[PDB]
Design a protein around this nucleic acid. Sequence first.
DNA 1: CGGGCTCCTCTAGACTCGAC
DNA 2: GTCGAGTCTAGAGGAGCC
Lengths: 349, 352, 934
Amino acid sequence: EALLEICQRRHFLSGSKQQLSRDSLLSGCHPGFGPLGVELRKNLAAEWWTSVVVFREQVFPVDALHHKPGPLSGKLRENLLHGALEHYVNCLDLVNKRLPYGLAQIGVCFHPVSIGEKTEASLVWFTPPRTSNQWLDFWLRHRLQWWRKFAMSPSNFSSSDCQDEEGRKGNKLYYNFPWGKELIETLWNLGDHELLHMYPGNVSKLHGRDGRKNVVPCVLSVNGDLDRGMLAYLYDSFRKVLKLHPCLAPIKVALDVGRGPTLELRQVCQGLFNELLENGISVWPGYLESSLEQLYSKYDEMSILFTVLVTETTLENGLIHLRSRDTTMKEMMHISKLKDFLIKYISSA
Amino acid sequence: EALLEICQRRHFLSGSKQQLSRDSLLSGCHPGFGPLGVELRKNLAAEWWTSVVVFREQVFPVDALHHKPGPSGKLRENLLHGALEHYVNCLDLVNKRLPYGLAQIGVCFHPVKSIGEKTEASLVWFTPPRTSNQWLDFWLRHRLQWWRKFAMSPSNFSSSDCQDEEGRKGNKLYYNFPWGKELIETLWNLGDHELLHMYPGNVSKLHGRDGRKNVVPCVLSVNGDLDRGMLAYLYDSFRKVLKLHPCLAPIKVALDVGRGPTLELRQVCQGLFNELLENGISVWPGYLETMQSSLEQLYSKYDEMSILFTVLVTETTLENGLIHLRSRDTTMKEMMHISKLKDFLIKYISSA
Amino acid sequence: GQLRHNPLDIQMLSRGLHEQIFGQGGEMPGEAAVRRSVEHLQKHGLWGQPAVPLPDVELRLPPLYGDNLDQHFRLLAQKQSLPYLEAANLLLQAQLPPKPPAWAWAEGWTRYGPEGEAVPVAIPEERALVFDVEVCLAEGTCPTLAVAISPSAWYSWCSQRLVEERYSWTSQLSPADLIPLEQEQLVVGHNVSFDRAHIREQYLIQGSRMRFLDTMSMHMAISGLSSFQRSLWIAAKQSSWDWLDISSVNSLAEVHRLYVGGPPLEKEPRELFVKGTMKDIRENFQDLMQYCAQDVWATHEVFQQQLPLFLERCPHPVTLAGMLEMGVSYLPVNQNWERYLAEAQGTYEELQREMKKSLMDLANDACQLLSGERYKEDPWLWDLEWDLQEFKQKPCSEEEEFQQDVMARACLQKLKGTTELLPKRPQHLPGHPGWYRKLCPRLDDPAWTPGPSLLSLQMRVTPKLMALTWDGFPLHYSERHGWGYLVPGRRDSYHHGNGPYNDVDIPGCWFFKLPHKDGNSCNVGSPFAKDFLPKMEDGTLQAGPGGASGPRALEINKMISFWRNAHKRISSQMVVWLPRSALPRAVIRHPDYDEEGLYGAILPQVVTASTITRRAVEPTWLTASNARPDRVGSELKAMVQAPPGYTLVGADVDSQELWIAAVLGDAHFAGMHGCTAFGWMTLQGRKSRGTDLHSKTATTVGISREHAKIFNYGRIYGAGQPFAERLLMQFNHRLTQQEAAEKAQQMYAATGGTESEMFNKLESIATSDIPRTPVLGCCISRALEPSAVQEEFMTSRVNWVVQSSAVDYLHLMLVAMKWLFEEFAIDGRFCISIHDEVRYLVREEDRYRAALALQITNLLTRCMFAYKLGLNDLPQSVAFFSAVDIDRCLRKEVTMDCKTPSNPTGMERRYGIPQGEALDIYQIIELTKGSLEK
DNA sequence: CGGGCTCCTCTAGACTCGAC
DNA sequence: GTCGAGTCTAGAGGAGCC
Ligand SMILES: Nc1ccn([C@H]2C[C@H](O)[C@@H](COP(=O)(O)OP(=O)(O)OP(=O)(O)O)O2)c(=O)n1
Ligand SMILES: O=C(Nc1ccn(-c2ccccc2)n1)N[C@H]1CCOc2c(Cl)cccc21
Ligand SMILES: [Ca+2]
């Protein structure tokens, strides 16, 4: 309740205070995300993308549409698996008919609740049937590690094993919210049922090379909710403070001023702001405008990593007051050393 | 027709020649983009974000739902409505100081009845009425410069003044496709009409500080089509090559391997792969290809894919660290030590 | 009645004005003079033509002092320039104690007594000084240190930036950042405008009584050199030649050598204020301060030597009073200045990139001609350097995946440690041809950019890359002849032009130069000049890529040519932004006051007399272009905007040198007006109706009035018929060679002739033993007198009479304007004086009084010109100013909105600058009731 | 025989300094 | 100690003004 109030007040979640709803948040009926929530979800999507698609030569992006033209009067997509399966055939030319090969995408999924929208990151992995379980365990371990990496308390990120109606093996990842455990990701070993259903007859197009023999693959579905991931990380990261992981926190540096002269200090702050922005460090231009305690509380509630204060002293020697969110300590360091310090800190996070 | 063949062959575009008609591309009824098309579009969106939201203190991102429920629901045709729905709440961030904007890149649904999905970038600029024309001119110049700074032929991007049925001022950008001009961006100097319609009642809620004066902001709306702009850049890029911008080429570098020893060169290539990936450079792993072709065929393939550089790690790399780099722009080859590759590739791109 | 006429029927001044100006009891021309005038006019077909009587003007002019107009001008100038001559005399009489053995490292002003002691003071507190200010160029434009010479003590000044080291200083200067000085005060220096520009109190909107004297100005007044003479003098220092030993260049060393002599002056070879840092100045404080003291002492010696010679060869007080008032220029600015700089630089960068993209693409596409030696079949690029250098040398488990990643990283790292055999400086693009490497910026370059970015239109490979073609023949560059083109067909001509040359010798082809706009003697440097745009439109000059590549290249070049050559000048202008306390109450209380808007001033670095004709020079403002639709940053003067509550009231003299030449020729022929054909043509006209000489020429030939100015003024000063033919072909491309020659004959047929008497009078003044100005009596430079150069440099000396007369015109206008502004308490001051245009920053409430004062000033100056020539009368045609411009910004016309590529919305939309108004005499009289009082 | 000024970029040449 | 890449200089041609 307090966390949601902070999120609404500090522009993580949009809408009125009473409009805020646990179930609406969990189902996709919330009005939307504030700028900070948007930046946090973008950070999560970038981290997921680097983990899955970037660092692998078999995982590729896809552009499945939001609608399903043709007879079943189209309808909104409910899962990203179908677009990947539609992309399965013509994208085998990318890998020269080699197996395994994967397709991944982060898109908008519409589910019947009203209408709810969930931003879901899904990976569809095509596997020769022999190593389906081995690749399933590989992805289970890697995804659970990715979820646990940013957590202050990675014990709350749980895993469990289940079976579907047909009995195929499949795991289910979870996060332990204060009210209870909620699903954040799900893995299934579906097999060739959907691939054959969407490609009836002429199995020659569905074959793939596996040790110089042609094989029809088995699909592994890895589907996780990034919106629920955003909520899970906000709850995990909470003196009012939002101790988000530096790879996820939306705004990293707060840049402020002190007393006069206003023009020269503002020029110094603008130079520092541009220098930080040129190297991928998000800043909060708080120098465009209260007590130090109030500003520090506001920055702590906004998941701000560091606070920089430029005063009259800075013109004389270049020292800027530096404050850390994790450890409530202040230090003075030279201006030219601030950028390298921030880059190092983010890299060492 | 050759360009669309290359785009579908190099997985810029999906489907067959039936759905690849230019009407299908312009409408939005084509199938999804291919992975290289998705990467080009994502680089375009990243550049748009860097130019509009990143280097602007007054601009914040906004989230608008793809559907607007209430009076059965409907999908969205424009991002402007969702952006205007956040005006009062995003007034709090800027301490009620104008100008300030809300930006968003998303997919809007258009009737073509079929539905054609378009990816659109939108900026909603709340400005005091006194300077509304000045800000409209500033944003027109800024957006036209943005479109022209990635174009091999910036003259193909044009702006035309226009007026609405109510006489409201606005501008329309274009790209001169080979058949004709197609609208790729539109600016409108909408007044407070939409804001007052969406927020009836007390107007003190909408007051923003124009210096030392409170005033209702005129809503300047900028809307650009990222799919049509991506196709515009594909036409602008197109010896068969796609001279896309170094900041827009979907895959920056292609990694290959020479003669034996195979085992050691694979390790070298994998380490270099991890280095370039960790340094934010997209790489095409051609060393994994089993059906090896001649150097000329690989060069043609990489040129069509808009590959800026081809790295050829040979056995000589194992003895002196020298790798061979070919560039699309010049078709010339050079040898650079393996220690200096990340630095240059970061320099070459950041300085483009 | 108030209507008057002369024996030649030209309407003269009104009866009341002629009574107040010329008095009574004049001398009639007499019968013989009138008969000669009538015979001349009738022979040249001008007698008997009526003219519309311009309305009679009635003014109660302010009470003129003395017994005639010349005595009035002398008394005004003497009262204006009396205390400053006293200050100069104080400088001349007294000497100085020797310079202190060790200077003071302190902030502010210190007074050096005897034996080198230093005492802290607020200001020097002296009526006369010699000034030299040093500025650390790398740090910025803030003053660093200065030394002031006084008849009683030495003086030294050091800024707190030199004394105190800080992390950062403000890049926008303030009055508190400058040197404090300053009832009249005189300050002397070698280039005193630069020293004046660093004074705190000179940037106040309200004027100050302090004036400044320049030794370069007095050097040009006494013994100067022309540009050709300067070149010859420098060539000699490394038919007549006696002028060498009586003249020197404006460098302080040469001026000291010429006027004082002795051991040569020495300058610090390290250049610690030009190429050095602030730390170097702190370490080398004593040496730099000693060099400053040496320079100021040399300036004192040169001033002592120059003042009597100047007062002898320029005896009229008006010349000195004008030079005093010509160096107090003032240009007000605001934040729109910074906005203009930013917009101009942005537009320039955008257009520059747009131009360079095409050139880079063409260069990249041509690199492929290296393969197969196809470059030797390219008609354009078969001559460049295609040689190539050589490179020079001296599912796995988690544990398994981690081990594989570690092994890969370690294997990569081991190879990354093999730089021992690698030379430290990387070879530049060894594998790309040399012509390519040159165009590619080196890696270390702070501003690095990918591709052959160093490429531009001015280079010698751009025409070869763009495959430029002249009439179907490829372009080709020859060192001995410049740009040309090769016409194939040699069997070792069917084309006509600048002719075959056997010098170039490209086998199988002839060589023809591109037709240059200044004849077959000159060479063409680049085929992208403005002159070649019509040739591309006509299709003679074509680009290989076709479409609009060539036209777009030349259009971009025309758009960015001025900013390319002037952005250093304009961006480096020193602007001191006054705070709120410095501004007057009128500006603060005005409705147009912008609290968030900066207000400042630029003081032009004007050398008052830096010409053999004593015209002023200024690198930026006297070369500042006017706003044009296709020039980046050409709205420069339009950025000079009066503060709130202030307007710029100014005017430009109409047909100045034509009238001066005509009045000289008339006074030579007979003691009246309109005696000659040229003077009658000049007098009979009106600029409002488009019947003036420049307009008449612009109608008789399809050139514009601005080009007609050049045509007429070339005709006066020795331009032969071929020059006129070239100008006609340049400004009117429809004219053929035969047609252009015909109009040259027509304009030069009657030059016993129309312009005979003025020519004779100018040659009379030029060949005199001591040539002097016919009005104010100022002698020519000693290096141009007949005893020095004899018959050489004739055109310079003949043009000198009219040009120095125009300078006397400016001096008279300045003196009269100062008198009128002081007498009736007009709250305004001098803004800037270009060669024949005077601008005055006047308060809003008194713009019409300023206009009346300007009209009275022009009337009195023309009457003085007539009186000094003995004519004793002035025509009504040239009596007053045709239009006095009242405007807030500075532009030639009050109507233009100044739409430029940098400012496409115009001055009215982007800024709040309304259009001004141009007013004639009658409107001013109706507005101010014919009186200057309040 | 246009005159009087101003400053800029590009290129060739001489010179200087550092790495092999 | 010998040669190849930075640095300064000077000339040539173009482009602003009155
Ligand atoms: N190409 C030029 C331009 C100018 N001048 C000289 C002669 C003029 O008398 C003086 C001032 O030039 P203007 O262009 O102001 O000419 P006018 O003042 O005579 O013309 P206007 O009547 O338009 O003011 O400069 C010249 O000799 N050659
Ligand atoms: O754009 C640029 N800029 C520059 C400037 C200096 N550079 C350099 C780089 C390494 C060693 C020496 C010199 N590079 N270079 C392109 C153009 C030619 O082709 C290539 C190739 Cl083949 C590889 C890499 C870059 C390029
Ligand atoms: Ca004039």
